[PDB]
Design a binder for these strands. Structure first.
Lengths: 228, 219
DNA sequence: GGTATAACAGGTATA
DNA sequence: TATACCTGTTATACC
């Protein structure tokens, strides 16, 4: 450890991991694979090989580096996706106990209402083409299977991408994944009429956005979320 | 892929299914490894990940246990997230903007189902909120209590958790606080809350949203 | 004596 | 072709 300090009983792995943390915080490395390999650091610190592996693995969990296969660690910063990855541990309890299912629906409804209100209020002359091509590519009836579902979720994503906030897209993807993960026994009984109703509601929504009237858009969105 | 994450999620869902309660009820990890056809460092990495999460307790050579409280992981995630500040100077305001997208989803709900049982509660809350006198201690406590009783109107435990999380996040983020400017800030805040509760009584969510937007713009 | 923690080499998919 | 991930082995201090 370049300082002659064993620290065996007090877990010497903490010493090397905090030394690596300090060396990274000292702005002595770049943003990629500037850090050496495992054997180089092992020989430089006169320690074991599995210790450095555990250190890096713990560091990745803490959200500091990233490794894939046959490449050194790439130092980065913990973004919004890292927080969502570290979370979701208690999400199973919510779907386990009877409640919470309506709470997630209410949260999603509030989020979508807020974002559609912001989009209708800050409606520029360029984002109209995005929603136009979205409703155009989601207008034809060619595949009544899962293609319409992915088209609808892509339309929702491009609608949520209007503000331009990295945390917004992250939480949107997280909520959509947590919602589609709790859809058991999906059957194709009345999904075609559901697709037609969704198309009509999207047409009404874009018409209300063009006319600058969030009331009708909010009513159509509430009706769509109540019809499920 | 990586075996580690597989057995990690397996033991996570096992401890979530309430298969083992308090104490050292887990079997020997050697025969677990022999049955799962995994490696020794994988189990050590899984235990280290669980210790970093804050669910098990390993000191010397004893076995792991369960952890019912969840306050350690909260401050852990707080310290881990409150770091991305020097990268984006104004992007933090985006996070503040997120708070907007939350509060605008609250003042427009009082006119939905609140009839009289919540009106008395918010009135008796704002009574003490206005009776408060201290600028740094009483006014901040009154403001957070008003925000809590506002978030508790729909009756949702997730909303309260999100609100307190945003509160502690902004508290850890903002490093400098004022006293003279905060006085007029909370003054205008409760002056606008008066109009907010007036519009709530009159069943007009537009005026409440406008007052909230003006309060957020006043900073 | 059981416990975790320590060290080493060897075979193989992959960029 | 060079890389790291996974699997093989044994030695040692403490309760």
């Amino acid at each position: 450890n370049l300082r002659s300090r064993p620290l065996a009983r007090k877990k010497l792995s903490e010493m090397v991991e905090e030394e690596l943390e300090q060396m990274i915080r000292r702005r002595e490395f770049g943003e990629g694979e500037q850090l050496p390999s495992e054997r180089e650091l092992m020989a430089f610190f006169n320690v074991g090989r599995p210790s450095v592996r555990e250190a890096l693995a713990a560091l990745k969990r803490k959200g500091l580096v990233q490794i894939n296969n046959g490449e050194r660690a790439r130092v980065s910063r913990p973004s919004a996706d890292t927080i969502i990855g570290e979370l979701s541990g208690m999400a199973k309890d919510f779907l386990s106990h009877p409640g919470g299912i309506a709470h997630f629906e209410q949260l999603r409804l509030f989020f979508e209402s807020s974002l559609v209100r912001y989009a209708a209020e800050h409606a520029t002359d360029e984002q109209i083409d995005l929603l136009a091509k979205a409703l155009e590519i989601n207008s034809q009836s060619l595949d009544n299977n899962a293609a319409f579902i992915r088209s609808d979720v892509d339309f929702h994503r491009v609608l949520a991408e209007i503000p331009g906030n990295p945390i917004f897209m992250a939480i949107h993807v997280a909520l959509l994944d947590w919602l589609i993960a709790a859809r058991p026994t999906v059957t194709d009984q009345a999904l075609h009429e559901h697709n037609n109703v969704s198309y009509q509601q999207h047409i009404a929504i874009v018409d209300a956005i063009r006319r600058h009237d969030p009331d009708e858009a909010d009513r159509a969105l509430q009706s769509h979320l109540n019809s499920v």
